[model samples]
Target: GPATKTEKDTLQSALPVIENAEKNTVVTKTLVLPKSDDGSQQTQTITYKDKTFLSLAIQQKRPVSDELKTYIDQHGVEETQKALLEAEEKDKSIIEARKLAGFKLETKLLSATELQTTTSFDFQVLDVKKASQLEHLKNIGLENLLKNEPSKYISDRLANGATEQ
Candidate 1:
């Protein structure tokens, strides 16, 4: 049966609650962006499980364009962040909707970092389950750790009945 317009509106209003729950599960880390000595943006590379994940760069802040400044001056910061975050949430909700529709999706970011001139963010995906597995890697290090502690690593995997072809 086709859902009526009222039904759709109800679901739409409910989304913010669901998205807030998802946002609460994420772990955030605040780190410093390396200072730029050459007056160029500084880049920070993030690696996960031995692969380069994301490269973050800090851009120099620029003056707001005239129209945007006028808008900001009218609405001020409180409303500005609200509108920005709302827009971000809508975009992210689309991704979440696709995942719920059963595509074999990879992970995604569920929230946006606060906007700033020199910002640093730890790039993380939205998969809570995968994030937990990644947390183990953070605690124990990675392949090099495996190499150094081959016997213990292999023994743990074996005890867990992990097998490879």
Candidate 2:
């Protein structure tokens, strides 16, 4: 089998789902650093299913963005979303798990073309880094990132899908 532009298009179409994954995280993260660098790393570990990721360790320091904040927030309301609409409404039965389940891409697609979820299932949306990643996506070729970008993040956002946010 070959990956076609259409295949990448399919993924590109799902960007909205990634947006959902972001705005609707079951968990959010806030890293807090001690007043002094202990010369150690601060890590946050979260478990879903049976998998967990060990964050890369680095010197502890509050981000400049956190200057006015002390706690990080995570929200879990998307699961209760009344409907799971898709531009690729026909794809509901298909499991593109190889792509969305984190093997390649993560998160589902949205119902609008230009919008998307800002995460891979392997990553969380609340992550500042993930936001940066989405920012990075503004120009990356869909094919190159298709190996990891959740296909539904953009595809569902296409006009042919349901009309809900």
Candidate 3:
């Protein structure tokens, strides 16, 4: 009834195939990931409505029937369309720009050390790949990013006591 636990996993894993198919291309944040008749990590794509492509779930040997094709068109398309739209919107909001132009330096005095003044900085980092170059910036940027993006946090294994696996 719940698509079974394995089926649920298959469905969830299929989502990434759907997104990766459409993430880079513009105008066609429209794609589909049908349930693979045989569960495998491989993917196959079909060009749709010109430049837009549809990612179909891979089957072992047999091709999907007309019924499955119709199902993907009618149902899978709707699901993937929504998924791709949200991903695109998220991508646009974050910084993808290459140059490190926006650096706002604000200094304030919290309490004066023996001969120096304490300072606090408020900063924004949009893209992580570009932000890792500067050690001073990388430390804080990664700290905040991991605090927000747990799946990207590498130290969780150590933190959570993941000793064996």
Clashes of each: 0, 34, 0
lDDT, candidates in the order shown = 0.34, 0.28, 0.31
Cα lDDT over the full model 2: 0.28
lDDT of 1 by residue, 24-128 (tens): 322211222334444333222222333232212222322334554555678765565566445534665334433421212122212232243332223343333
Best by TM-score: 1
Full candidate order by TM-score, most accurate first = 1, 3, 2
lDDT of 3: 0.31
- Give the range of the ten consecutive residues with the poorest summed lDDT in model 1: 101-110
The TM-scores of all predictions, comma-separated, are 0.27, 0.16, 0.20
Q: How big is the RMSD of model 2? A: 23.1
* Candidate 2 backbone overlaps, count: 34
Q: List the residue pairs that clash in candidate 3.
A: none
User: Which one wins by TM-score: 2 or 3?
Assistant: 3
